[PDB]
Amino acid sequence: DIFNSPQNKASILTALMEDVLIPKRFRPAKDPLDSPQAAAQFLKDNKYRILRPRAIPTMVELETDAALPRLRQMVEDGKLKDTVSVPEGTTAFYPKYYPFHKPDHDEVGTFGAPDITLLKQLTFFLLENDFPTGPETLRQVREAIATLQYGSGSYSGQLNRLLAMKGVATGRNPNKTPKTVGYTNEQLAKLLEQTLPINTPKHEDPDLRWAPSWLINYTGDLSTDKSYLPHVTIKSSAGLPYIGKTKGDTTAEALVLADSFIRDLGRAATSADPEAGVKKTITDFWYLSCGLLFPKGERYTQVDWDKKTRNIWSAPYPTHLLLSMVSTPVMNESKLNITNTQTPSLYGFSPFHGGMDRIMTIIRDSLDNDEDLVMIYADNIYILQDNTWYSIDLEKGEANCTPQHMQAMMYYLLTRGWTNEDGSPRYNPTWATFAMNVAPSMVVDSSCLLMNLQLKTYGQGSGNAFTFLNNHLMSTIVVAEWVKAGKPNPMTKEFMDLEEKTGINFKIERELKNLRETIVEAVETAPQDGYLADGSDLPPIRPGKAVELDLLGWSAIYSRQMEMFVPVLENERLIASAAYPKGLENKALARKPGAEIAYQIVRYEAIRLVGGWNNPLLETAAKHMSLDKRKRLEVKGIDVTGFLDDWNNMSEFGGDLEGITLSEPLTNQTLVDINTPLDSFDPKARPQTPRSPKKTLDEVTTAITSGTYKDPKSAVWRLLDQRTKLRVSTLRDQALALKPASSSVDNWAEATEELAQQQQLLMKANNLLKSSLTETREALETIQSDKII
C-alpha cells in the first residue's frame, strides 16, 4: 500500500490550538483608551473640554393619570402603563453610557462579516465568463473586503473623532456666527427663501402653542384617535435620563418631561424674575442638552479603525420631541428641490422616476447656455463651472455650527413656516422662547456622555433633529460668499479663502473635468444589448461610460431603451456595500423569521437595483444567489412575500426606491418601473420659490451686499429678531409685546407695531443686551449642590 493522498500532520501543540483569494477577518487592535481614566487623560492631554459632571435625580414612580391627565382614559382602558418613572428623587446619580464596539479585539463575529459567499460566487462566475469588466470587479470586491470593515469602531476612534471636531470648530479655521460673517437673521432668511424654500405647516396642523401630550387625541374610536406629534423610531434609544431604554419603553416619561420643560419655561419666562426662573428650569433639565455619544455603524478603513469612528449624538427623547415639533410640520410640506422648483436645493431629491434625467437636463441646459450651476444638500455643495463638475463638502460639517446658526434657522422656520396668511404668528411667546432663546444651546455647543465622562460638544450634535437644516444653512453661507466673491473657480485660492471668510471648513471632493465631452461619451457608449438597451433580462457585455457626478452618491448612465439618463450607485459605494452588506439592522424586525429569511434575497436584489444590474460579473453572481434562495423557499413552501413587498423597511437602499416589490425576481421591467417618470419635464415650467419667487440667489446676494434686508418689515418678525439680542430677564416684557399678535386680537398689527416701538426703548440699554444662548449654556453647565447615591 503506496501512493496515498497526503494529509497535513501537525504538532500536538498546534492541534490543541495561505489563500490569497479570501482575505482573513479583521481583528481590531486592543484599545488603550477603553477605560474612563485613560480616555479622560487622553482628552486632557489634547486640551479637549471635560465638563464638571452633573447628576440626575433618582427615578420616582408616579401615577400616569396624575402626570399625564390628558391620557387618563388610555390608563382606564388599560392601553397605557399605570405608572411613570420620573427623575424627581431626593438623591441623584451620575449617568454612565458604555456603548458596544463590534467587532473588537476579543470578539470577531457575525456582525460586520464580509460577504465571502458573494466573493466566492464572483470568483466561480469569473472563471466561467469572459466579461471584460469582470477581473476588475472581482479585484475591487476582494480589495474592499481586505481594506474595509463594517462596524461600530472603537473608544479610540470616537475620542479621536471628537478631537477632529474640536479642530474644525476651533483650530485652523475657527467658527464664525452668521452676524460675524456679515448676515442678520433677516438677510439669512432671504437667502434661505431661495436655497431652502419652505411652505407653512398644514392649516389643520396645530400651532406651536401646546404641551406635547395635548396633541394626542384618544377616545377609543380608531377612526378619530390621532397623534399630532412627530413620529418616532420606537426601537431607538431614549437618551438621557433613560440610558438602556428605548423610545418605546419611555414615551409616557418623555411626554411628562417635555410637557414639564415647556410648561416650566413658559411660567418662568412671564414670572417676577424671568432670569432666575428660566436659568433654574434650564439647570434642572440640564440632561436634556446632553447627548449619548453613540458610535455610528459604517464601512470604516481597517488601518484607520482606531483613528476615526463617526458618532451619533443621541438626543434626549423630550428634546428630540420638542425640536421635531418645530421642524417636521414645516419640512413635511416643503419637498422643494431643483427638479420641481427653481431652487439650488436638493431637499427631497430622488434620482429614481426620472430624477437623474431631470438633473442631467438642467446640467446639459446650463452647459449649452454657458451658465454656472449650484446645488445644495445639507453639507454637500455641487458647482458646475468652466465645463467642470465640482463636489464640495463641508469638512466635518456639524463641527462648524454655532448656536447662532441654529437660531437663524429657527428664525427662518418661525417667520416663513409658523406664520398665518395675515402675518400673525402660529406660535405663542412660550414656544418662541423655547425655539429662539433656549433650543439652539441645547444641541449646539452643549455636551455629550461617553462612559462616565460628560464632554463638551464642539458644534452641533450629529444626528440631532436639526442636523440637515443647520448644515444646509452653513452651505448656504458658503455659496452666498462664493456668489459675493464673483464665483471663483473651486480649484483656486480665491475659493479656498472663503473658509476664513465664513468660518466654515470645506474641501473639494471631486473634480469631473470635460463635463460636456463626458456626457457625449455616456450617450455614445450606451450599449445596444441587455437591460435598458434592447430590454433583455441580461447585463450588457460592455457597459457604457458613467457621468460620475456622485450626486448624493449617484452616477448617471444613458439608457437607449428609455432615451434618458438613469441613476447607478457610485462605483466605490456599490463595491463597499457588496463587500460589507449591512444586516437586518432595520427596525426590530431582526427577530422575525419571515423578515430574516426575506432579507437574504432583498440584499442581492437591492444591490442589483441600485446599479449592480449594469456590472456583468456582479449582476451574474447576485442574480444567481437571489434566484437560488427564492427557488429553495418556493419548493419548501416557505412564504416571505409580505417582507419582500415591504422590503424598503429592511434594505439600506429602501428609502430611495419606495413602493416597488421584490416578491418577483428583478427583470428589465423592474428597472423600467423605477425609472418611469410620472410627468414630462420642462425646466422652465418648474414653479418659482414660495417666497420672493422672481428673485434668484444671485439677486438676493447682490441686495445683501447693498445693505438690503437688515431688518424685517413685519413687526412680529422684528420682535423675533429682537428676541435673539435681548437677555432672559426681558422675557416677561417680550411676551407682552407678542401677546396681541399671538392671540390675534382685533387690530393686533397696529398694537404689535406700537409694542415694538416700546421694546425698541430697551434697545438702548447695553445692560439688557446679552445672548440668551450664552445664558442657556451657563445655566446648563452650572453645578448646584445635591446628595448623590
Author numbering: 3 to 19, 27 to 798
Any passages from the paper?
Members of the family Birnaviridae possess bi-segmented double-stranded RNA (dsRNA) genomes and form virions with non-enveloped single-shelled icosahedral capsids. From sequence analysis it was proposed that the RdRPs of Birnaviridae possess a non-canonical active site where the polymerase sequence motifs are re-ordered C-A-B, motif C containing ADN in place of the conserved GDD catalytic residues. We have cloned, expressed and solved the structure of the RdRP VP1 from IPNV in both its apo form and bound to a catalytic metal (magnesium).
As for ΔC55 VP1 in the large unit cell, electron density for residues 3–19 was present in the active site. Some residual electron density could be observed linking residue 19 to the first residue (E27) of an adjacent polymerase molecule, but it was not sufficiently well-resolved to allow modeling of the intervening residues. Despite being crystallized in the presence of Mn2+ and ATP, no metal ions or nucleotides were observed at the active site. While additional electron density was seen connected to the C-terminus of the molecular replacement search model in three of the four copies of VP1 present in the asymmetric unit only eight additional residues (791–798) could be placed, suggesting that residues 799–845 are not ordered. Surprisingly the C-terminus of the fourth molecule in the asymmetric unit (from residue 687 onwards) is significantly refolded compared to the other IPNV VP1 molecules and IBDV VP1. The strand that runs along the side of the palm domain is shifted ‘upward’ to lie at the outer rim of the active site cleft. Neither the helix that lay between the base of the palm and fingers (residues 706–716), the three-helix bundle (residues 724–781) nor the intervening loop region are evident; instead the polypeptide has flipped up and projects away from the back of the fingers. Models of a VP1 elongation complex based on superposition of the reovirus RdRP elongation complex or of HIV reverse transcriptase in complex with a DNA template require refolding of a small segment of the VP1 C-terminal extension, residues 654–670, in order to accommodate the nascent RNA duplex (not shown).
